[PDB]
Scaffold this active site. Structure first.
Site, PDB file in Angstrom:
ATOM      1  N   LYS A  29     -15.726 -40.768 -48.860  1.00 23.71           N
ATOM      2  CA  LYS A  29     -15.972 -40.570 -47.335  1.00 23.71           C
ATOM      3  C   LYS A  29     -17.325 -41.510 -47.311  1.00 23.71           C
ATOM      4  CE  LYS A  29     -13.511 -36.495 -46.060  1.00 23.71           C
ATOM      5  NZ  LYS A  29     -13.772 -34.861 -46.056  1.00 23.71           N
ATOM      6  N   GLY A  88     -14.239 -30.043 -51.467  1.00 28.17           N
ATOM      7  CA  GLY A  88     -12.778 -29.990 -51.577  1.00 28.17           C
ATOM      8  C   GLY A  88     -12.037 -30.665 -52.458  1.00 28.17           C
TER       9      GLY A  88
END
Ligand SMILES: Nc1ncnc2c1ncn2[C@@H]1O[C@H](COP(=O)(O)OP(=O)(O)O)[C@@H](O)[C@H]1O
Ligand code: BEF
Ligand SMILES: [Cl-]
Ligand SMILES: [Mg+2]
Length: 407
Positions: free
Chosen positions: A206, A364
Protein backbone atom coordinates in the site's frame (compact mmCIF):
# COMPACT_ATOMS: atom_id res chain seq x y z
CA UNK A 1 -10.36 5.55 25.45
CA UNK A 2 -10.27 6.97 28.94
CA UNK A 3 -12.45 9.83 27.67
CA UNK A 4 -14.65 7.61 25.49
CA UNK A 5 -17.63 5.34 26.01
CA UNK A 6 -16.59 1.71 25.78
CA UNK A 7 -18.62 -1.47 25.57
CA UNK A 8 -18.09 -2.44 29.21
CA UNK A 9 -20.27 0.61 30.10
CA UNK A 10 -22.78 0.27 27.23
CA UNK A 11 -26.19 -1.08 28.32
CA UNK A 12 -27.04 -3.57 25.52
CA UNK A 13 -30.00 -5.35 27.13
CA UNK A 14 -32.86 -5.49 24.60
CA UNK A 15 -30.86 -3.23 22.27
CA UNK A 16 -30.04 -3.86 18.65
CA UNK A 17 -26.25 -3.34 18.31
CA UNK A 18 -24.79 -2.20 15.00
CA UNK A 19 -21.06 -2.92 15.13
CA UNK A 20 -18.27 -1.91 12.78
CA UNK A 21 -15.60 -4.60 12.70
CA UNK A 22 -12.50 -5.11 10.56
CA UNK A 23 -13.26 -8.32 8.73
CA UNK A 24 -10.94 -7.35 5.82
CA UNK A 25 -9.30 -10.79 6.00
CA UNK A 26 -6.72 -12.01 3.53
CA UNK A 27 -7.93 -14.35 0.80
CA UNK A 28 -6.25 -16.71 -1.68
CA UNK A 29 -8.01 -19.07 -4.04
CA UNK A 30 -11.26 -17.50 -2.66
CA UNK A 31 -10.54 -19.03 0.78
CA UNK A 32 -9.72 -17.09 3.94
CA UNK A 33 -6.04 -17.47 4.73
CA UNK A 34 -6.13 -16.01 8.23
CA UNK A 35 -9.15 -15.66 10.48
CA UNK A 36 -7.18 -13.53 13.00
CA UNK A 37 -9.32 -10.40 12.44
CA UNK A 38 -12.60 -12.32 12.78
CA UNK A 39 -11.47 -14.15 15.92
CA UNK A 40 -10.34 -10.79 17.34
CA UNK A 41 -13.92 -9.36 17.27
CA UNK A 42 -15.50 -12.38 18.99
CA UNK A 43 -15.12 -11.05 22.58
CA UNK A 44 -17.17 -7.87 21.82
CA UNK A 45 -19.77 -9.90 19.88
CA UNK A 46 -20.12 -12.54 22.60
CA UNK A 47 -20.31 -9.83 25.23
CA UNK A 48 -23.27 -8.18 23.47
CA UNK A 49 -25.13 -11.49 23.15
CA UNK A 50 -24.29 -12.56 26.70
CA UNK A 51 -25.59 -9.28 28.10
CA UNK A 52 -28.91 -9.45 26.29
CA UNK A 53 -28.51 -7.68 22.95
CA UNK A 54 -31.54 -8.22 20.74
CA UNK A 55 -29.22 -8.40 17.76
CA UNK A 56 -25.65 -7.78 16.62
CA UNK A 57 -25.42 -6.41 13.08
CA UNK A 58 -21.83 -6.65 11.85
CA UNK A 59 -20.48 -4.47 9.07
CA UNK A 60 -17.08 -4.30 7.35
CA UNK A 61 -15.30 -3.71 4.11
CA UNK A 62 -13.28 -6.31 2.26
CA UNK A 63 -10.46 -5.25 0.02
CA UNK A 64 -10.83 -2.26 -2.21
CA UNK A 65 -13.75 -2.72 -4.64
CA UNK A 66 -13.83 1.08 -5.07
CA UNK A 67 -17.57 1.72 -4.64
CA UNK A 68 -19.04 -0.78 -7.09
CA UNK A 69 -20.64 -4.12 -6.21
CA UNK A 70 -18.10 -6.89 -6.73
CA UNK A 71 -19.74 -9.98 -5.17
CA UNK A 72 -17.75 -12.37 -7.37
CA UNK A 73 -14.48 -10.89 -6.05
CA UNK A 74 -14.95 -9.23 -2.65
CA UNK A 75 -18.05 -10.70 -0.93
CA UNK A 76 -18.04 -11.05 2.87
CA UNK A 77 -20.11 -14.29 2.64
CA UNK A 78 -17.11 -16.60 3.34
CA UNK A 79 -16.56 -14.59 6.54
CA UNK A 80 -20.14 -15.34 7.67
CA UNK A 81 -19.35 -19.06 7.47
CA UNK A 82 -16.08 -18.69 9.38
CA UNK A 83 -17.67 -16.47 12.06
CA UNK A 84 -20.38 -19.15 12.72
CA UNK A 85 -17.75 -21.64 13.90
CA UNK A 86 -15.72 -19.11 15.90
CA UNK A 87 -18.80 -17.73 17.70
CA UNK A 88 -20.71 -20.92 18.39
CA UNK A 89 -23.85 -19.16 17.05
CA UNK A 90 -25.23 -19.01 13.47
CA UNK A 91 -25.04 -15.77 11.46
CA UNK A 92 -27.41 -14.51 8.77
CA UNK A 93 -25.65 -12.99 5.79
CA UNK A 94 -27.31 -10.19 3.87
CA UNK A 95 -26.41 -9.42 0.21
CA UNK A 96 -26.34 -5.64 0.79
CA UNK A 97 -25.56 -3.29 3.72
CA UNK A 98 -28.36 -0.68 3.08
CA UNK A 99 -31.48 0.10 2.65
CA UNK A 100 -35.04 -1.26 2.10
CA UNK A 101 -34.50 -5.05 2.44
CA UNK A 102 -31.51 -4.74 4.79
CA UNK A 103 -33.43 -2.32 7.02
CA UNK A 104 -36.40 -4.73 7.19
CA UNK A 105 -34.07 -7.66 8.10
CA UNK A 106 -32.46 -5.69 10.93
CA UNK A 107 -35.61 -3.74 12.06
CA UNK A 108 -36.97 -6.24 14.58
CA UNK A 109 -34.83 -9.41 14.70
CA UNK A 110 -35.41 -12.54 16.77
CA UNK A 111 -33.60 -12.31 20.09
CA UNK A 112 -29.86 -13.08 19.83
CA UNK A 113 -29.72 -12.69 16.04
CA UNK A 114 -26.26 -12.17 14.56
CA UNK A 115 -26.30 -10.50 11.14
CA UNK A 116 -23.35 -9.86 8.78
CA UNK A 117 -23.90 -7.24 6.11
CA UNK A 118 -22.26 -7.29 2.67
CA UNK A 119 -19.03 -5.36 1.87
CA UNK A 120 -19.61 -1.65 2.73
CA UNK A 121 -17.26 -0.60 -0.08
CA UNK A 122 -19.67 -1.93 -2.74
CA UNK A 123 -21.15 1.53 -2.16
CA UNK A 124 -19.20 4.63 -3.12
CA UNK A 125 -20.65 6.38 -0.04
CA UNK A 126 -18.52 4.37 2.42
CA UNK A 127 -15.15 5.89 1.32
CA UNK A 128 -16.96 7.96 -0.37
CA UNK A 129 -14.92 8.28 -3.51
CA UNK A 130 -13.83 5.51 -5.87
CA UNK A 131 -17.23 11.49 -7.05
CA UNK A 132 -19.49 10.51 -4.06
CA UNK A 133 -22.30 13.10 -3.57
CA UNK A 134 -22.92 14.65 -0.11
CA UNK A 135 -26.69 14.02 0.02
CA UNK A 136 -26.12 10.33 -0.78
CA UNK A 137 -23.31 10.00 1.80
CA UNK A 138 -25.82 11.37 4.33
CA UNK A 139 -28.48 8.86 3.22
CA UNK A 140 -25.98 5.96 3.39
CA UNK A 141 -25.05 6.94 6.94
CA UNK A 142 -28.73 7.37 7.89
CA UNK A 143 -29.43 3.84 6.56
CA UNK A 144 -26.55 2.22 8.52
CA UNK A 145 -27.79 4.11 11.65
CA UNK A 146 -31.24 2.46 11.39
CA UNK A 147 -29.76 -1.04 11.74
CA UNK A 148 -29.01 -0.78 15.47
CA UNK A 149 -30.20 1.13 18.53
CA UNK A 150 -26.63 1.56 19.78
CA UNK A 151 -23.25 1.51 17.96
CA UNK A 152 -20.01 -0.26 18.66
CA UNK A 153 -16.77 0.22 16.80
CA UNK A 154 -14.40 -2.66 17.21
CA UNK A 155 -12.67 -2.15 13.87
CA UNK A 156 -9.16 -1.37 15.06
CA UNK A 157 -7.76 -2.35 11.69
CA UNK A 158 -9.78 0.32 9.97
CA UNK A 159 -9.68 2.97 12.74
CA UNK A 160 -7.43 5.24 10.62
CA UNK A 161 -10.19 5.53 8.05
CA UNK A 162 -12.71 8.35 8.38
CA UNK A 163 -15.26 6.38 6.35
CA UNK A 164 -19.02 6.39 6.71
CA UNK A 165 -19.36 3.26 8.80
CA UNK A 166 -16.47 4.40 11.05
CA UNK A 167 -17.31 8.06 11.77
CA UNK A 168 -20.80 8.65 10.35
CA UNK A 169 -23.21 6.53 12.36
CA UNK A 170 -25.75 8.76 14.07
CA UNK A 171 -26.90 7.03 17.21
CA UNK A 172 -26.84 8.44 20.79
CA UNK A 173 -24.34 5.88 22.13
CA UNK A 174 -21.21 5.11 20.13
CA UNK A 175 -18.87 2.80 22.10
CA UNK A 176 -15.40 1.44 21.52
CA UNK A 177 -15.25 -2.30 21.59
CA UNK A 178 -12.84 -4.55 23.48
CA UNK A 179 -10.44 -5.12 20.55
CA UNK A 180 -10.25 -1.40 19.99
CA UNK A 181 -9.46 -1.01 23.68
CA UNK A 182 -6.92 -3.90 23.74
CA UNK A 183 -4.99 -2.57 20.76
CA UNK A 184 -5.01 1.09 21.85
CA UNK A 185 -3.89 0.11 25.35
CA UNK A 186 -1.04 -2.03 24.08
CA UNK A 187 0.26 0.71 21.83
CA UNK A 188 -0.16 3.44 24.47
CA UNK A 189 2.10 1.46 26.72
CA UNK A 190 4.63 0.44 24.07
CA UNK A 191 4.88 3.91 22.40
CA UNK A 192 5.11 5.94 25.63
CA UNK A 193 8.86 5.52 26.10
CA UNK A 194 10.03 3.07 23.50
CA UNK A 195 13.15 0.98 23.99
CA UNK A 196 15.99 2.29 21.82
CA UNK A 197 17.13 1.89 19.14
CA UNK A 198 13.50 1.81 17.96
CA UNK A 199 13.30 0.27 14.48
CA UNK A 200 10.35 0.60 12.12
CA UNK A 201 10.10 -1.94 9.29
CA UNK A 202 7.87 -0.73 6.46
CA UNK A 203 7.11 -3.06 3.59
CA UNK A 204 4.02 -4.34 1.80
CA UNK A 205 2.02 -3.02 -1.12
CA UNK A 206 0.00 0.00 0.00
CA UNK A 207 2.68 2.37 -1.20
CA UNK A 208 0.57 5.48 -1.94
CA UNK A 209 -0.89 5.41 1.57
CA UNK A 210 2.12 4.28 3.58
CA UNK A 211 4.79 6.47 1.99
CA UNK A 212 2.77 9.44 3.41
CA UNK A 213 3.21 8.15 6.99
CA UNK A 214 7.03 8.18 6.86
CA UNK A 215 7.47 11.90 7.50
CA UNK A 216 5.92 11.86 10.99
CA UNK A 217 7.39 8.38 11.80
CA UNK A 218 10.87 9.88 11.32
CA UNK A 219 10.36 11.93 14.47
CA UNK A 220 9.72 8.79 16.52
CA UNK A 221 12.11 6.06 15.41
CA UNK A 222 15.88 5.65 15.29
CA UNK A 223 16.01 3.35 12.27
CA UNK A 224 13.74 2.43 9.42
CA UNK A 225 13.84 -0.45 7.00
CA UNK A 226 12.00 0.44 3.83
CA UNK A 227 11.30 -2.81 2.02
CA UNK A 228 8.76 -4.78 0.12
CA UNK A 229 6.83 -2.86 -2.46
CA UNK A 230 7.74 0.47 -0.80
CA UNK A 231 11.44 0.32 -1.68
CA UNK A 232 11.13 0.75 -5.45
CA UNK A 233 9.91 4.35 -5.33
CA UNK A 234 12.94 5.25 -3.16
CA UNK A 235 15.40 3.31 -5.29
CA UNK A 236 14.21 4.81 -8.59
CA UNK A 237 14.50 8.36 -7.16
CA UNK A 238 17.71 8.01 -5.10
CA UNK A 239 19.68 5.57 -7.25
CA UNK A 240 18.14 6.07 -10.67
CA UNK A 241 17.52 2.33 -10.56
CA UNK A 242 15.54 0.63 -13.29
CA UNK A 243 12.59 -1.00 -11.51
CA UNK A 244 10.62 -2.47 -14.43
CA UNK A 245 6.99 -3.08 -13.52
CA UNK A 246 7.62 -3.05 -9.76
CA UNK A 247 5.28 -1.07 -7.52
CA UNK A 248 5.87 2.63 -7.93
CA UNK A 249 4.11 5.64 -6.44
CA UNK A 250 4.31 8.78 -8.56
CA UNK A 251 3.15 11.13 -5.77
CA UNK A 252 5.44 9.64 -3.13
CA UNK A 253 8.41 9.80 -5.50
CA UNK A 254 8.12 13.57 -5.20
CA UNK A 255 8.90 13.58 -1.45
CA UNK A 256 11.56 10.82 -1.33
CA UNK A 257 14.55 13.25 -1.17
CA UNK A 258 12.84 15.36 1.49
CA UNK A 259 12.20 12.19 3.57
CA UNK A 260 15.86 11.13 3.23
CA UNK A 261 16.96 14.65 4.21
CA UNK A 262 14.74 14.50 7.27
CA UNK A 263 16.03 11.07 8.22
CA UNK A 264 19.57 12.46 8.04
CA UNK A 265 18.59 15.52 10.12
CA UNK A 266 16.98 13.24 12.74
CA UNK A 267 19.78 10.62 12.82
CA UNK A 268 17.46 7.88 11.49
CA UNK A 269 19.42 5.17 9.64
CA UNK A 270 17.51 4.11 6.54
CA UNK A 271 18.01 0.52 5.32
CA UNK A 272 16.81 -0.04 1.74
CA UNK A 273 17.28 -3.38 -0.08
CA UNK A 274 20.28 -3.86 -2.40
CA UNK A 275 19.10 -7.00 -4.21
CA UNK A 276 15.90 -8.68 -5.39
CA UNK A 277 14.07 -11.79 -6.57
CA UNK A 278 12.35 -10.71 -9.79
CA UNK A 279 9.33 -12.07 -11.69
CA UNK A 280 8.17 -11.78 -15.32
CA UNK A 281 4.56 -11.15 -14.25
CA UNK A 282 2.45 -10.80 -11.10
CA UNK A 283 1.82 -14.53 -10.78
CA UNK A 284 2.56 -17.33 -8.34
CA UNK A 285 4.15 -19.24 -11.23
CA UNK A 286 6.03 -16.38 -12.88
CA UNK A 287 9.50 -17.07 -14.25
CA UNK A 288 11.96 -15.69 -11.75
CA UNK A 289 15.32 -13.96 -11.73
CA UNK A 290 17.80 -12.00 -9.64
CA UNK A 291 18.72 -8.31 -9.64
CA UNK A 292 20.79 -5.91 -7.64
CA UNK A 293 20.42 -2.12 -7.37
CA UNK A 294 23.47 -1.81 -9.68
CA UNK A 295 22.07 -4.21 -12.32
CA UNK A 296 18.57 -2.75 -12.23
CA UNK A 297 15.45 -4.83 -12.87
CA UNK A 298 14.84 -5.66 -16.55
CA UNK A 299 12.01 -4.06 -18.59
CA UNK A 300 8.72 -5.90 -17.94
CA UNK A 301 9.93 -7.65 -14.75
CA UNK A 302 9.07 -6.75 -11.17
CA UNK A 303 10.89 -7.20 -7.88
CA UNK A 304 8.73 -9.39 -5.64
CA UNK A 305 11.22 -10.22 -2.88
CA UNK A 306 14.49 -8.84 -1.58
CA UNK A 307 17.64 -10.92 -2.04
CA UNK A 308 20.22 -12.31 0.39
CA UNK A 309 22.35 -9.17 0.68
CA UNK A 310 19.22 -7.19 1.65
CA UNK A 311 18.25 -9.83 4.19
CA UNK A 312 21.69 -9.47 5.79
CA UNK A 313 21.27 -5.68 6.08
CA UNK A 314 17.77 -6.13 7.48
CA UNK A 315 19.19 -8.64 9.99
CA UNK A 316 21.80 -6.06 10.99
CA UNK A 317 19.12 -3.47 11.81
CA UNK A 318 17.10 -6.03 13.78
CA UNK A 319 20.20 -7.00 15.79
CA UNK A 320 20.64 -3.33 16.83
CA UNK A 321 16.95 -2.86 17.78
CA UNK A 322 15.61 -2.90 21.30
CA UNK A 323 12.09 -2.25 19.95
CA UNK A 324 10.56 -3.01 16.51
CA UNK A 325 7.25 -2.14 14.84
CA UNK A 326 6.87 -4.08 11.59
CA UNK A 327 4.12 -3.44 9.08
CA UNK A 328 4.35 -4.96 5.60
CA UNK A 329 6.03 -8.11 4.31
CA UNK A 330 9.33 -7.54 2.50
CA UNK A 331 8.19 -9.67 -0.46
CA UNK A 332 5.12 -11.46 -1.81
CA UNK A 333 5.28 -14.02 0.98
CA UNK A 334 2.02 -15.66 -0.09
CA UNK A 335 3.87 -17.15 -3.04
CA UNK A 336 6.71 -19.48 -2.15
CA UNK A 337 8.99 -18.18 -4.85
CA UNK A 338 8.93 -14.77 -3.15
CA UNK A 339 8.68 -15.72 0.54
CA UNK A 340 12.36 -16.14 1.55
CA UNK A 341 13.10 -12.48 2.47
CA UNK A 342 10.05 -12.28 4.72
CA UNK A 343 10.79 -15.66 6.33
CA UNK A 344 14.40 -14.68 6.99
CA UNK A 345 13.30 -11.37 8.51
CA UNK A 346 10.70 -13.18 10.62
CA UNK A 347 13.43 -15.58 11.84
CA UNK A 348 15.50 -12.54 12.91
CA UNK A 349 12.56 -10.80 14.63
CA UNK A 350 11.83 -13.99 16.57
CA UNK A 351 15.54 -14.25 17.52
CA UNK A 352 15.38 -10.63 18.66
CA UNK A 353 12.33 -11.24 20.84
CA UNK A 354 14.19 -14.11 22.50
CA UNK A 355 17.02 -11.84 23.72
CA UNK A 356 14.66 -9.09 25.03
CA UNK A 357 13.61 -7.05 21.97
CA UNK A 358 10.05 -5.69 22.12
CA UNK A 359 8.70 -6.84 18.73
CA UNK A 360 5.35 -5.64 17.37
CA UNK A 361 4.02 -7.05 14.14
CA UNK A 362 0.86 -5.52 12.65
CA UNK A 363 -1.42 -5.79 9.62
CA UNK A 364 -3.95 -8.05 7.93
CA UNK A 365 -1.22 -9.46 5.67
CA UNK A 366 1.82 -9.08 7.94
CA UNK A 367 0.07 -10.90 10.82
CA UNK A 368 -0.57 -13.68 8.32
CA UNK A 369 3.23 -14.12 8.11
CA UNK A 370 3.07 -14.91 11.80
CA UNK A 371 0.28 -17.41 11.20
CA UNK A 372 2.13 -19.03 8.23
CA UNK A 373 5.40 -19.57 10.10
CA UNK A 374 3.80 -20.17 13.48
CA UNK A 375 5.34 -17.17 15.21
CA UNK A 376 2.26 -15.51 16.74
CA UNK A 377 3.50 -16.45 20.26
CA UNK A 378 7.17 -15.85 19.40
CA UNK A 379 6.95 -12.04 19.06
CA UNK A 380 5.82 -9.50 21.67
CA UNK A 381 2.52 -8.45 20.00
CA UNK A 382 0.67 -9.22 16.83
CA UNK A 383 -1.73 -6.45 15.95
CA UNK A 384 -4.84 -6.59 13.81
CA UNK A 385 -3.90 -3.07 12.59
CA UNK A 386 -1.27 -2.28 9.97
CA UNK A 387 -1.73 1.27 8.67
CA UNK A 388 -3.83 1.91 11.83
CA UNK A 389 -0.81 0.98 13.97
CA UNK A 390 1.57 3.10 11.92
CA UNK A 391 -0.78 6.08 12.44
CA UNK A 392 -0.56 5.51 16.26
CA UNK A 393 3.22 5.36 15.80
CA UNK A 394 3.01 8.86 14.13
CA UNK A 395 1.26 10.10 17.28
CA UNK A 396 -2.19 10.57 15.77
CA UNK A 397 -5.65 10.05 17.20
CA UNK A 398 -7.45 7.62 14.94
CA UNK A 399 -10.71 8.90 13.39
CA UNK A 400 -12.61 5.76 14.37
CA UNK A 401 -11.72 6.39 18.02
CA UNK A 402 -12.28 10.19 17.83
CA UNK A 403 -15.87 9.61 16.55
CA UNK A 404 -16.83 7.58 19.65
CA UNK A 405 -19.07 9.13 22.35
CA UNK A 406 -17.25 11.04 25.12
CA UNK A 407 -17.96 9.85 28.67
N1 LIG B 1 7.79 -6.18 -3.74
C1 LIG B 1 6.45 -6.32 -3.66
N2 LIG B 1 5.63 -6.10 -4.70
C2 LIG B 1 4.29 -6.27 -4.64
N3 LIG B 1 3.66 -6.60 -3.50
C3 LIG B 1 4.39 -6.84 -2.38
C4 LIG B 1 5.85 -6.67 -2.37
N4 LIG B 1 6.30 -6.95 -1.12
C5 LIG B 1 5.21 -7.22 -0.39
N5 LIG B 1 4.09 -7.19 -1.14
C6 LIG B 1 2.70 -7.44 -0.74
O1 LIG B 1 2.30 -6.55 0.30
C7 LIG B 1 1.06 -7.08 0.73
C8 LIG B 1 0.66 -6.59 2.09
O2 LIG B 1 0.86 -5.20 2.17
P1 LIG B 1 -0.10 -4.35 3.18
O3 LIG B 1 -1.55 -4.58 2.82
O4 LIG B 1 0.47 -2.95 3.16
O5 LIG B 1 0.27 -5.00 4.55
P2 LIG B 1 -0.74 -5.24 5.80
O6 LIG B 1 -1.95 -6.05 5.59
O7 LIG B 1 0.16 -5.91 6.73
O8 LIG B 1 -0.89 -3.81 6.37
C9 LIG B 1 1.27 -8.60 0.73
O9 LIG B 1 0.06 -9.10 0.20
C10 LIG B 1 2.46 -8.84 -0.18
O10 LIG B 1 2.15 -9.79 -1.23
F1 BEF C 1 -3.49 -3.77 4.68
BE1 BEF C 1 -3.63 -3.04 6.29
F2 BEF C 1 -2.57 -1.65 6.52
F3 BEF C 1 -3.62 -4.15 7.64
CL1 LIG D 1 -2.21 2.51 -1.05
MG1 LIG E 1 -2.68 -5.54 4.02
Amino acid sequence: LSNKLTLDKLDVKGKRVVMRVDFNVPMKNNQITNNQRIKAAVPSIKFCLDNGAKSVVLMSHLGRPDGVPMPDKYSLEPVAVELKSLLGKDVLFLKDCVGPEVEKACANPAAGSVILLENLRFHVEEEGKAKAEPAKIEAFRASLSKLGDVYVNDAFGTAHRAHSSMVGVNLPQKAGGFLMKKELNYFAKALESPERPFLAILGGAKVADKIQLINNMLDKVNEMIIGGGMAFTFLKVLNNMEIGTSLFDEEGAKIVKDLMSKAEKNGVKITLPVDFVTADKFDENAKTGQATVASGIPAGWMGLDCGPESSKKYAEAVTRAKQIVWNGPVGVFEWEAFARGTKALMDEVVKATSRGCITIIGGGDTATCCAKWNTEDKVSHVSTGGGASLELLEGKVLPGVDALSNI
